Structures are given as structure tokens and as C-alpha cells.
RNA sequence: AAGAAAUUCGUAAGGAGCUAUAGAACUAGUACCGCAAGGGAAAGAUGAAAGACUAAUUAAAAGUAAGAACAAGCAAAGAUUAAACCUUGUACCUUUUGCAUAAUGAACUAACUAGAAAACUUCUAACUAAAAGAAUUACAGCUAGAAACCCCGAAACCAAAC
RNA sequence: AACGAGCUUGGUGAUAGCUGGUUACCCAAAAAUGAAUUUAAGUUCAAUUUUAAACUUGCUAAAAAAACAAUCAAAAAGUAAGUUUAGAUUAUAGCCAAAAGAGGACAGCUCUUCUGGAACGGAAAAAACCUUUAAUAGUGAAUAAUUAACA
């Protein structure tokens, strides 16, 4: 990680994260299942069904990605017609 | 304190000063000086009573 | 040559002890030293012993013949305690 | 150790000289002056750090940006080496990752 | 040299002033004095709780000597004195022997008599009135 | 007051007496004492203690977690997606109630920003304000609001109370001037034309039901009536309403501001407006 | 505010060379082994007399920061009350004085029981009377400033404060504008509908 | 790991520095060292007057002297009438396992000689569906303050001179 | 004047998972097991530990009854902790005694599992065994292990 870049003096986003994970404004992260496109001819139908899903990240993994991405990737985005509109907030959670 | 102990002559000499100083003289001739710099009234009162005893 | 005035000051007092203690000065009567009033100290002397005293009588007791003669000579350039001593 | 054998000369400060007396005046030039001038504009200092603050690596790069082309050869060489040392320190060393 | 310690002289003095009575270079060199002083302070702390055990062993030596003059072993003297309900610690008993020899003989005789009474009670079984000194006072 | 009375008795306030607020500052721990010195919090001898441990995301040598997950297009094209800072009807009514929006005058993006009703960032791909259905029930205000995106239910609230809702497209250059007019006038450049929506947005802004500015005027009546039947209210007659001219007011499709034509220049210092007399420039601007 | 009026201006010019900027120290003094001495790679190191400082001041440093606009304005309001309640603030119609002699001004302060150091605030620099200008200039303690130059630090340093009536109105409007105002859409200097 | 642009914005003499192991290597690129390129020091101190016989100032560092030693022992501590005799007591640091009678390092004195950054968190305030002195963030936030991450050392590698 | 490939300057404050070092007081809490790794002189995660906050049951014990001295656990009782959330590391080689397996249905030896310890007191020796709830001043006191055995 570049903690202080020469030209600007700012932290730099890791683009390996931007191309694999989606952050919801609450703080959750979405990911795919590794191998969901690999050797599908020998996987069971139930196995394939699990792979197609989108999965969440843990507290540690979420903490890591928040260190490898900059605040710009942690803002509110008002996209019209967004298919993730309802998932950016947590409701009826006491904890 | 002065009335309670009438055998202790008390001298108070306010002067332009940096550290307040108490000098105790005993009858055998021994001297003792203790620095009172930035001590509250409670500390001084307790400190003085030790000197008298 | 370091900064500050305080380090010298603490050492100046250290020099003070070295000179005074190695070569002490001759003793000086407590009268010459600061914080002396004759009358107040005389009063405390009676109170310290718990015995009520006649202040005028006590003053005469401390007076001595030698002191009177020295004072008179200085004046040129007040009753003795002899009667009290005999009694 | 060793200590001075004499007291150093007394240091006397005149607290009512012109510079001390008027210190701070015009710090509110903006809010009380219809925001004509920002108070940062009153700072006297190096051109590259008037009204700006940053850590040494940022300070090094900022000095280069403003006066990089007007610097002496040896000074510029040392600055370049100073930047490269700081870069590897702040971006590759330290207790925390 | 923006900031330098101008009072290091007195910091060395604190360590050195506790080493003058030593012998050798340890009384004047800070690198050597400092190590010597710490042991001196530690021993002083580990000896505040050894004079309270030696001073007692001194007393037992002198009480053993004192009772032996009158023919009593140390165990007999102390135990019987307690059994008579008289409580005197080992510090005054040494004082009594050294400075009040006549009083100690009374204690020696009293301790001896109770020892005899105890022997009689064990030797004579059954319900018999115990010795005059054997009688124990009770506090409620 | 009573607390103020105490200050009178206390000594004069001076530079010596200054004190920071309780607990405002923290002690800065330095490495010069036993607890924080010696090994200085870095443990025994090793890589992390030499100061040279590996980078973040390095898991010792096995394939890292972040690199071993398939790349997916969650964030693809994010920088070119269109953003509309939504406006609800609760905020609209709340703003109108407190006198921070003038309902009698026509409403536009400039008067929303002026009354701080909405905050817009053109540099972050904002393309305008989308009206939202939240708060329709409490909405009982008649107002001519122009918003780039509208909704079916949001339209009902405006129309039922007897108001005009229109949707107009402002391109990135136009939006910046609309949100922030004054500086543009300070630049000294002439006012620009407003480009038509790109092909993707053409169907929306030409659709009658969406109340598009380019939509056919003739089809509006029918579309409003169908919506009126759907939500169980009777269409009010705006024409009879005294302020028909104001409500009906609509800016030209090539106008950023209602009362200013493209190509003019505004001189704030002299309090004048300059209009080009050149025929060639007029041709370009009129287009 | 008092600390702010101290720090943001501050720029420190203390600097120390590091072990690379020190002249020389290129060659390795001696081989690692065979000589019975410790291992060194340059005669200019932090462990060497004449070497480069380890963690010293580097370049010019800046301590620039600005408090929020309302915070610094609030400080002025607080300072104004403190002087008023402690009977250190005197309100005057105009600064006109009978004579330019500095002695009169100093004597008047003692007569009226003002503090040794007096701060005088006038509405504008240009209109200030000539008589006051001559007197205050000759006096170190009596410092004269215009209305726009009011600052918290000056009031804290000066015992009493003399305010002209128009300046009080000037200060009252400026500070009370800070509350009841929006957040700036622009830099304020740019044209605004209702701002001077 | 690197990293734009379009497009906006702008009229710009001092020291909370050093004071002879510090600040420049510098009293000097001199002495000295190398065939050469090249490397590279150390230090001074009277007073108004020396046309007043060069002052002062200090139980003050290690080192000595004044004043060698007197059964017995990590050199001390508890003590004591008494300096030593009597009792108690396996140098220090680092290090090994959390053990050393080990193994490293230190003849002694003076001076010098090594933790530094604000993404997330905590604490303290200003205003508050708004905060920010232009671009930022927001389903109580936002702004400002304080609070953080060392030193010395290779065998080597490349360029250009000698 | 030490050539498996000269020397000087510069790159250069080369780099070092390795060796060495890292400067005031005080109070408090406090562990070398599992996984992967050109990994076993390292790092990362789990587990443990810790500072704060939220609110409520937690530890020992736990009858019957299951699956067979344990895995599980209900009323009780003795007692004050346990769960969740936010932040953060170092650590990842043990040492010795005593129990029980398992390697050749052996002892040992090498492992594995449970238990305990880290005196100033005691056991010729004496960090590991036995007596010992923290640390403070006193010229008080009662005591523990043990001070060998008299077969
Ligand atoms: Mg720090
Ligand atoms: Mg591999
Ligand atoms: Mg926005
Ligand atoms: Mg160099
Ligand atoms: Mg070289
Ligand atoms: Mg090197
Ligand atoms: Mg230097
Ligand atoms: Mg020098
Ligand atoms: Mg030099
Ligand atoms: Mg000497
Ligand atoms: Mg001896
Ligand atoms: Mg050695
Ligand atoms: Mg290194
Ligand atoms: Mg384990
Ligand atoms: Mg390996
Ligand atoms: Mg390793």
C-alpha cells in the first residue's frame, strides 16, 4: 500500500479490490464465489447453485478492504434505478 | 496558631519573593527551613503543626 | 556553554556551602540577624516557661555591666542585674 | 559534570515593544472586513508553505514544486535524495501496516 | 544542541553521596558506584526484617542462659509461665534477667512450681484439687 | 446571569490564566521510561521489530484473499453513471413552510440550491434532482417545480393539489452554471446553449407520461387525466387559477435560465446586459 | 482562539543536516574484521562526532491551521463580555482629546482607574483623530487599533478596552451576522444578495 | 505499483535557528595521507587601560598527592561503645525456557549517541438536517483540536574518472 | 604492502526474515495451542489477551435420559461475573515434576493428554519438590514444611 504518494501525498486505492468487491454504504462488502466459472461439468447441481450467489465479507475482511480503498469508494451514490438501492442500509438490527 | 502556641514568636515578612520559606528555630539552637512553594493552606497548616510538636 | 540561568543558580548555592562550611564565620548574636524584636522575644520567654513575669524586671536581668560600658564608650565616640544576681 | 562558576548575564525582555504590543492585530481581517482577505494571506514565510501544512515528505515535494526550477544543483540533488529516502520510509517501513 | 541537560551534576551527586564510605573506585565513579549502591539499598531492605528475627534469637540465647542458672531448661521456663496465665514476652524476660536478677528468681521458682504441679496432676489421676498456682482464672 | 456574576468577582482574565478544556488534550507517550522504553513496544528481535514487515494483504506467501476472488463488474463504469440527488416531498413542504422557497415564483435547480434545500456536486456526476414519493400525503402545496427526474406518485401529489411538474435535462456544463450562476457571470464568458439529451435519455424526455420538456404538448391532457383517475382525484383547472401564466411558465429547451437567452453577457459591475449584434453569432446561438 | 492567534502564523526555520547531507563520509573507514574495532560504514554517521543529526528539525516547518469561522467569531463575543463584566470595557462616543500631549492620556487613565495597558478601537483607520494619533504613538502601553483589526489576543494582553460607539455597532452587526446565516455557497467576497 | 486530462480558482527584512565534540569540512580545502584520481583534520578565550610586570574563578570528573599495608573473602548490609573480627549475602546487562558457577559487551571520566506520519478508532469542543472561508461529506451528521509507527553494521551491484 | 578480479568518487542513509543497541518516576492488567506459506531464524489468520461501550444472565455445581468417564445439563444453592459491539497488538521454540495412554495390547526412550510449580522458609546439593493470599513501620506473638532413622 502507498501510504503517502510522491506527487500528491495521499493514500492510494488498490485496484485489485475495486475490481472484485462491492461496498454497501453500511459497511458490508459483496463478493463472488471463487471457481464459479471453473470446471462446471464435474460440479453437482447443488454445488453450482451455491457458487452463483453473492456472498458477504467478515469483520476482518471488511476491515482489510477498508484499509485498501480510499474514502471516495465509501461515499453515497444516488444512482437512479440502482438494483442495490435497498441494500445500502441496515434495518431492525439491534447490536 | 499564634494564640494556641504562645511560646512561638511568629514573624511574617511579605516581600517580593519567588519561593515562600518557613524557618523554624528550636531552643537547643537547631534551625530548620522547609520550602512552601505552591502549597495549599491545608498542607501548610499540617506542616506547621509538625514543626511545633 | 549550555543554555539557561537556573543550572548556574543551583550551583552558586553549592559554592555557598563549600565556602561557608570549610571556613565558617565567627558566631554572631541572634540580635544582629534578621527577624529580631527584643520585646516580643522577651514575652515569649515567660510564656514558654508558663511563668508570668514582670516584663520590666526581666529586662533588667539580661542587662550586664560589660554591655553598659561598651555602649557608653560607643556613644562618646540602663540598670545592671547585679542586685538581682545577689538575690 | 561541570557547571558555570559565575551567573550568566540577566536577560531583559521589553514586553511593550511595537512588535509585541500589536501582535495579533488583523487576525480577524476577513470576518470583520467582509471577507476581502483570508487571514492566511498575512503569513510571512517560504512561498511553498504560506497557509499550508504537511509532513516532511509532502513538505519536500511541495518545496520542489514551487522552486524546483530555481534551486541550486547541489541543493536540488539533496532534495531529490531526501524525497527518495522518505518515500521508502513512509511507504515501506513502520510498525503499522 | 538545542536542548541539553544542565542539571546532570546533581543527578550524579544523588548516587555518589550514598557511596563515600565505600572503598575503591566504587565510591567515586558513577558507573561503579550506582551498581554498588543498589545492592546497599536492597540489603538494607532485606535486613529490616532480619533484625526482628535475630534479636529474638538473641533473647532465646539469654533466656536459656538465665533459666539454666536456676536449673530450668528453656522449654520448661516459658511453657510453665504461660500455663500460670502470666504473659511476658521474650524481650522483657531478657531485660528482667540482666537488670532485675532477684525478680527473675521469683519467675524461675514460679515456673518450676507449676512444672511440679503439672507432673503431680499427671502422676495423680482422678478428681483431686489442682495446685494453688495451677488454678486458672477465667474471663467472660 | 448568575454564572456571569461569578466572573465579576474572579480575577482579571489574562494570558497566564488560560487553561485548555478538561480532557481536551492527551499525554504524548515518549520512549524514555521503562514501561515505554527498552524494547519500546516492538517485541523481541524479528522482522516486525526491525520495522520491515511485509505489505498489507500479504498472508505469508499463500495466494492472498483479495487476489484469489474472481474479478466481477460491480463497480464497472461507475465514474460515468448518472447521479440525481433525490428530493422528497417532506423536504419540499418543509422548505416551503419555513420561507426558504418561494412557491409563488417558478421553482428550478437554482432556487433549490439558493435556499440550501438541496446540495449538488456537478464534479461527482450529479445530473440534477429527482423528486421522490416520500411525503406525498402531507404535501398540500401548489408549486411549479422543475426536476430532471420525476416519479408517477410524486407527479400525483403535485398535480392533485393543482401544480405543474416538468422534467428537463441539463448537461454537465449546463448543470454547473445552473447550480452556481454568479461565478459564471464573473468569468466574462457568454452564456452557453444547452445540449439536447443523449440518445439514451431521448425516449424519457420525449415521453408525455414522464412530463418531458420536449414531449408533445397535445398529449399532456390525456396523460394527466389517466393519472388522475388512477389515484382517485379530479383534475383541477389550472387555467381558471389566477396564476396560470406563472404555473404554465416553461423555459426554452435551449435556455439555462428562464429570462436569459444564450449568447448574452452579464455585467454585474455596470448592472447591464450585453447582447451580440453579429448575425453570424446570432445564427449559432439561435440554433 | 488565543492559541490559534499564536500557532497558524508560526513558521520555524530550525534545520539540521542528516547523515547524507554531511560533507564526506563516502568511504568505509576500515575493514569489518582484523582490527579490533566496531563496524562503521561512514565517518559521518549519527554515532560519530561531526556526523549528521538523527531526528532533528528538517527544513522550514509550518503550524498552519484555521478554526471554523463561527468558533473564532464566538471567541470575540466571549472576550467582549469578559471585559464588560470585569469593568475593563469603557464605551466612548468619540476618541477626540483636548490636547495631543501624551502625558494627559496617561494621567487621565489613572484618574479614571483604568489599567496600565489600554487598547483603543476606532471605526476606521483613515478617520481617526490626529490628536489621538500623536499621543498614542508616543505611549507604549496605550495601543491604538482600528475596528477591523480587533483580535482576542490583543484584548487578553491589554487590561482595559476603550470602544467608540460606532465601533460597537460595527462589531455588533459583524458578529451577530455569523449566527442566523447560511453556509457559504461561495467564497463570501463574491456577490451575494443580502451581504455587503 | 504507476497515474492523467477536460474543466474550474489565484493582483503576493525575519528567526518558540546554532554558540567551539554545536553551526559549514573550514582558523583550511591548509597541515597531513595517497604515484594519481582523491580523502581530510584539530584548535580560541585577561582588562576601560599591558604606554596598567596577563587576569580570574572552582570541597568540584576520571588520575594522583597529602596519608602503603595489618587473619576472613562481589567488599556491602544489620549492626555496634568500637574502622576491621560477629551474622546475612552465588557482579551487571543482554541472552538463552520463565536456570546460570554459563556465552556475549564494558579499564575509568567528560561530552555526544536511537519511535517520525492521522485511513479507522477514542477524547474535547463549534454549528446542527445540516456542517465546511468554492469543488467535500451526510437516513445525526459535520468541522476543528489533541492523540502514531527508531539506531548502527555487510559480502556485493552499476556509472565514470584515476 | 590481502586481486576468483584494481582503486577513488557518485548512485547510497544500497539492502539485510540476521547480530548488537534503543536514555525519568509511579499504579494497574497480562500467553511458545490450530491453519497456510521457497514455510519451519519469517509473516498472516484463528484462538487467546487487552482498553472502552451496550445489556443480562454467567462460573462452580448441574437429578433423572439419553449418544456411551467423559459429550450433553434443571430445578436448586454457593457466588459475580458472562454475551454482544468498536479499537489494538505482541505472541506462534518452552523448562521440570507427577499422572494416563500410544508407538516395539511392553518398561524404558520419542511422542500425545491432564495437573501443578517459578521463596526471604525448608529438602548435603536446591529456578521446577514441600510449606507460603499482595506490600508497609515495630527491640511484639501464635504458627507451617523441616530440622533423619533406631527399626
Ligand atoms: Mg511520538
Ligand atoms: Mg508457494
Ligand atoms: Mg451531493
Ligand atoms: Mg554521501
Ligand atoms: Mg564506496
Ligand atoms: Mg553501509
Ligand atoms: Mg554537523
Ligand atoms: Mg566544528
Ligand atoms: Mg570539523
Ligand atoms: Mg579529583
Ligand atoms: Mg567480615
Ligand atoms: Mg571487555
Ligand atoms: Mg540498516
Ligand atoms: Mg497448547
Ligand atoms: Mg523458508
Ligand atoms: Mg524466517
UniProtKB/Swiss-Prot annotation, chain A:
Protein's gene: Mrpl35
GO BP of this protein: mitochondrial translation
Localization annotation: Mitochondrion
Keyword Ribonucleoprotein included in the entry's annotation: yes
Assigned keywords, A-Z: Mitochondrion, Ribonucleoprotein, Ribosomal protein, Transit peptide
Molecular function per GO: structural constituent of ribosome
Family the entry assigns: Belongs to the bacterial ribosomal protein bL35 family.
Highest taxon in the source lineage: Eukaryota
Presence of the UniProt keyword Glycosyltransferase in the record: no
GO CC, any one term: mitochondrial large ribosomal subunit
Annotated protein name in UniProt: Large ribosomal subunit protein bL35m
Native source species: Mus musculus (Mouse)
Curated annotation (Swiss-Prot), chain C:
Subcellular location: Mitochondrion
Family (UniProt): Belongs to the ribonuclease III family. Mitochondrion-specific ribosomal protein mL44 subfamily.
Functional summary from the UniProt entry: Component of the 39S subunit of mitochondrial ribosome. May have a function in the assembly/stability of nascent mitochondrial polypeptides exiting the ribosome.
Complex and partners: Component of the mitochondrial ribosome large subunit (39S) which comprises a 16S rRNA and about 50 distinct proteins.
Protein name per the record: Large ribosomal subunit protein mL44
Species, as recorded: Mus musculus
Swiss-Prot record, chain E:
Subcellular location: Mitochondrion
One GO CC term, this protein: mitochondrion
SUPFAM superfamilies: Ribosomal protein L20 (SSF74731)
Keyword terms of this UniProt record: Mitochondrion, Ribonucleoprotein, Ribosomal protein, Transit peptide
Main location: mitochondrion
Transmembrane residue ranges: none
One GO MF term: rRNA binding
GO BP terms: mitochondrial translation; translation
Subunit structure: Component of the mitochondrial ribosome large subunit (39S) which comprises a 16S rRNA and about 50 distinct proteins. Interacts with OXA1L.
Family the UniProt entry places it in: Belongs to the bacterial ribosomal protein bL20 family.
NCBIfam families noted in UniProt: rplT_bact (TIGR01032)
Name of the featured protein: Large ribosomal subunit protein bL20m
Curated annotation (Swiss-Prot), chain G:
Superkingdom of this protein's organism: Eukaryota
Molecular-function GO terms, alphabetical: structural constituent of ribosome
Gene Ontology annotations for the cellular component aspect, listed alphabetically: mitochondrial inner membrane; mitochondrial large ribosomal subunit; mitochondrion
GO biological process per UniProt: mitochondrial translation
UniProt-annotated stretches for the region Disordered: 21-41
PTM-bearing positions, type Omega-N-methylarginine: 49
Subunit structure: Component of the mitochondrial ribosome large subunit (39S) which comprises a 16S rRNA and about 50 distinct proteins. Interacts with MIEF1 upstream open reading frame protein.
Family: Belongs to the universal ribosomal protein uL4 family.
Name by which UniProt lists this protein: Large ribosomal subunit protein uL4m
Organism whose genome encodes this protein: Mus musculus
Span covered, complete protein: 99 to 294 of 294
Amino acid at each position: 500500500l502507498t501510504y503517502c504518494s510522491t506527487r500528491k501525498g495521499k493514500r492510494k486505492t488498490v485496484k485489485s479490490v475495486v475490481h472484485r468487491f462491492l461496498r454497501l454504504h453500511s459497511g458490508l462488502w459483496l463478493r463472488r464465489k471463487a471457481g464459479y466459472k471453473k470446471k462446471l461439468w464435474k460440479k453437482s447441481t447443488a454445488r453450482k447453485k451455491r457458487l452463483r450467489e453473492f456472498v458477504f465479507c467478515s469483520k476482518t475482511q471488511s476491515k482489510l478492504l477498508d484499509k485498501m480503498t480510499t474514502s471516495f469508494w465509501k461515499r453515497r451514490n444516488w444512482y437512479a434505478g440502482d438494483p442495490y438501492q435497498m441494500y445500502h442500509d441496515r434495518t431492525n438490527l439491534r447490536v | 496558631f499564634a494564640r494556641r502556641n504562645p511560646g512561638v514568636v511568629v514573624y511574617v515578612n511579605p516581600r517580593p519573593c519567588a519561593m515562600p520559606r518557613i524557618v523554624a528555630e528550636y531552643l537547643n539552637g537547631a534551625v530548620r527551613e522547609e520550602n512552601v512553594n505552591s502549597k495549599s493552606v491545608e498542607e501548610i497548616k499540617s506542616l506547621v503543626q509538625k514543626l511545633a510538636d | 556553554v549550555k543554555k539557561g540561568f537556573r543550572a548556574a543558580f543551583r550551583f552558586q548555592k553549592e559554592l555557598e556551602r563549600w565556602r561557608l562550611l570549610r571556613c565558617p564565620p565567627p558566631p554572631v548574636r541572634r540580635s544582629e540577624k534578621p527577624n529580631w524584636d527584643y520585646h516580643a522575644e522577651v514575652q515569649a520567654f515567660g510564656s514558654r516557661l508558663q511563668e508570668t513575669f514582670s516584663l520590666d524586671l526581666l529586662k533588667t536581668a539580661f542587662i550586664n555591666s560589660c554591655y553598659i560600658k561598651s555602649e557608653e564608650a560607643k556613644r562618646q565616640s540602663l540598670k545592671d542585674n547585679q542586685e538581682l544576681f545577689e538575690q | 559534570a561541570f557547571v558555570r562558576l559565575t551567573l550568566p548575564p540577566p536577560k531583559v525582555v521589553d514586553r511593550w515593544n511595537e512588535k509585541r504590543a500589536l501582535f495579533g492585530v488583523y487576525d480577524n481581517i476577513g470576518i470583520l472586513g467582509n471577507f476581502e482577505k483570508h487571514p492566511k494571506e498575512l503569513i510571512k514565510g517560504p512561498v511553498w508553505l504560506r497557509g499550508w501544512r504537511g509532513n516532511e515528505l509532502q513538505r519536500c515535494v511541495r518545496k520542489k514544486k514551487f522552486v524546483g526550477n530555481r534551486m541550486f544543483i547541489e541543493d536540488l540533488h539533496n532534495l531529490n535524495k531526501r524525497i527518495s529516502y522518505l518515500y521508502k520510509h513512509f511507504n515501506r517501513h513502520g510498525k503499522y501496516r | 544542541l538545542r536542548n541539553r541537560l544542565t542539571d546532570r551534576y546533581w543527578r550524579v551527586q544523588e548516587v555518589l553521596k550514598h557511596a563515600q564510605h565505600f572503598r575503591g573506585r566504587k565510591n567515586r565513579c558513577y558507573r561503579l558506584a550506582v551498581r554498588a549502591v543498589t545492592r546497599a539499598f536492597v540489603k538494607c531492605t532485606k535486613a529490616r526484617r532480619l533484625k526482628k528475627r535475630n534479636l529474638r534469637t538473641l533473647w532465646i540465647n539469654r533466656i536459656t542462659a538465665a533459666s539454666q542458672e536456676h536449673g530450668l531448661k528453656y522449654p520448661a521456663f516459658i511453657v510453665n509461665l504461660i500455663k500460670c496465665q502470666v504473659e511476658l514476652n521474650r524481650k522483657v524476660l531478657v531485660d528482667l534477667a540482666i537488670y532485675e536478677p532477684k525478680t527473675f528468681k521469683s519467675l524461675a521458682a514460679l515456673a518450676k512450681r507449676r512444672q511440679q504441679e503439672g507432673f503431680a496432676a499427671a502422676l495423680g489421676d482422678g478428681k483431686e484439687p489442682e495446685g494453688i498456682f495451677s488454678r486458672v482464672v477465667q474471663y467472660h | 446571569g448568575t454564572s456571569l456574576d461569578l466572573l465579576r468577582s474572579l480575577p482579571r482574565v489574562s494570558l497566564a490564566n488560560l487553561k485548555p478544556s478538561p480532557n481536551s488534550r492527551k499525554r504524548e507517550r515518549r520512549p524514555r521510561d521503562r514501561r515505554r522504553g527498552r524494547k519500546c513496544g516492538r517485541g523481541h528481535k524479528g522482522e516486525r521489530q526491525r520495522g520491515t514487515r511485509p505489505r498489507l494483504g500479504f498472508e505469508g506467501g499463500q495466494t492472498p484473499f483479495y487476489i484469489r476472488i474472481p474479478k466481477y463488474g460491480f463497480n464497472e463504469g461507475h465514474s460515468f453513471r448518472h447521479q440525481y440527488q433525490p428530493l422528497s416531498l417532506r423536504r419540499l413542504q418543509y422548505l416551503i413552510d419555513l420561507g426558504r422557497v418561494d412557491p409563488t415564483q417558478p421553482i428550478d435547480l437554482t432556487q433549490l440550491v439558493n435556499g440550501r434545500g438541496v446540495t449538488i456536486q456537478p464534479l461527482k456526476r450529479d445530473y440534477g434532482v429527482q423528486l421522490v414519493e416520500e411525503g406525498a400525503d402531507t404535501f398540500q402545496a401548489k408549486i411549479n417545480i422543475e426536476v430532471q427526474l420525476a416519479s408517477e406518485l410524486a407527479i400525483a401529489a403535485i398535480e392533485k393539489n393543482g401544480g405543474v411538474v416538468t422534467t428537463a435535462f441539463y448537461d454537465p456544463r449546463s448543470l454547473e452554471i445552473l447550480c452556481k450562476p454568479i461565478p459564471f457571470f464573473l468569468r466574462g464568458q457568454p452564456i452557453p446553449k444547452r445540449m439536447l439529451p443523449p440518445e439514451s435519455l431521448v425516449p424519457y424526455y420525449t415521453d408525455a407520461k414522464n412530463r418531458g420538456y420536449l414531449a408533445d404538448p397535445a398529449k399532456f391532457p390525456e396523460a394527466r387525466l389517466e393519472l388522475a383517475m388512477k389515484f382517485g382525484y379530479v383534475l383541477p383547472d389550472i387555467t381558471k387559477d389566477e396564476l396560470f401564466r406563472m404555473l404554465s411558465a416553461r423555459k426554452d429547451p435551449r435556455q439555462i435560465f428562464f429570462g436569459l437567452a444564450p449568447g448574452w453577457v452579464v455585467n454585474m459591475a455596470d448592472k447591464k446586459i450585453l447582447k451580440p449584434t453579429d448575425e453570424n453569432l446570432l445564427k449559432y446561438y439561435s440554433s | 482562539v488565543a492559541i490559534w492567534q499564536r500557532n497558524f502564523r508560526r513558521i520555524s526555520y530550525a534545520n539540521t543536516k542528516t547523515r547524507a547531507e554531511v560533507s564526506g563520509g563516502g568511504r568505509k573507514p576500515w575493514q569489518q574484521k582484523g582490527s579490533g574495532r566496531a563496524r562503521h560504514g561512514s565517518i559521518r554517521s549519527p554515532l560519530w562526532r561531526g556526523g549528521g543529526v538523527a531526528h532533528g528539525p528538517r527544513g522550514p516547518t509550518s503550524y498552519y491551521y484555521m478554526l471554523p469561522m463561527k468558533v473564532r467569531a464566538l471567541g470575540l463575543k466571549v472576550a467582549l463580555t469578559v471585559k464588560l463584566m470585569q469593568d475593563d470595557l469603557h464605551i466612548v462616543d468619540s476618541l477626540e482629546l483636548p490636547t495631543a500631549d501624551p502625558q494627559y492620556l496617561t494621567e487621565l487613565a489613572q484618574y479614571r482607574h483604568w489599567g496600565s495597558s489600554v487598547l483603543l478601537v476606532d471605526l476606521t483607520h483613515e478617520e481617526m483623530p490626529k490628536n489621538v494619533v500623536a499621543a498614542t504613538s508616543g505611549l507604549n502601553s496605550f495601543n491604538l487599533i482600528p475596528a477591523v483589526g480587533l483580535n482576542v489576543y490583543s484584548m487578553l494582553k491589554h487590561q482595559t478596552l476603550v470602544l467608540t460607539l460606532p465601533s460597537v455597532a460595527f462589531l455588533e452587526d459583524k458578529l451577530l451576522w455569523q449566527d442566523s446565516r447560511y453556509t457559504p455557497l461561495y467564497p463570501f467576497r463574491l456577490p451575494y444578495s443580502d451581504f455587503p
